[PDB]
Amino acid sequence: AAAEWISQQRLSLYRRSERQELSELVKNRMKHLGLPTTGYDHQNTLSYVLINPPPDTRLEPSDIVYLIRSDPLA
């Protein structure tokens, strides 16, 4: 009855995506080198730079403001 399990793995291995392919390749290398697989566990964001925006621009969350801080030793 091993053929039933072979067919189950065959359909699963055919249905797997490219992201699973890349993930298993990394994890295979990690086990071969000896590192734990967990912790390897994508970027749906868009970022840009606003140079000197007008003082009316709203501050959004996760905003990073470029600063020129004065010399601490001076």
Partner: protein, 112 residues
Amino acid sequence: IAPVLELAVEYVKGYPPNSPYIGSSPTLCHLLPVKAPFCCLRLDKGCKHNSYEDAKAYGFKNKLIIVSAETAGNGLYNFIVPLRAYYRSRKELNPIVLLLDNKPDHHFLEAI
């Protein structure tokens, strides 16, 4: 001739563990029960497990397939998989000897 009707060591069978590249279609192949150490994949030198130094000392039952390639890469992997596929007859398996100009990397050896 009957008419066509209108209406109708031993090897394990599994997938090669380490796929050498992305996009390699998984083929169910005749697999060794335990991974062969990289020393046992070399036909020239003898190792702990065998003292054989050429194909005469091995004494293969079947005739050999010798591949004279320059470097062992993912292409040579695509040569071995069709010959080791599960639907190929196991008794008719032909030993494959890779006659490489350059020493194979451990990535190729781990795949084969």
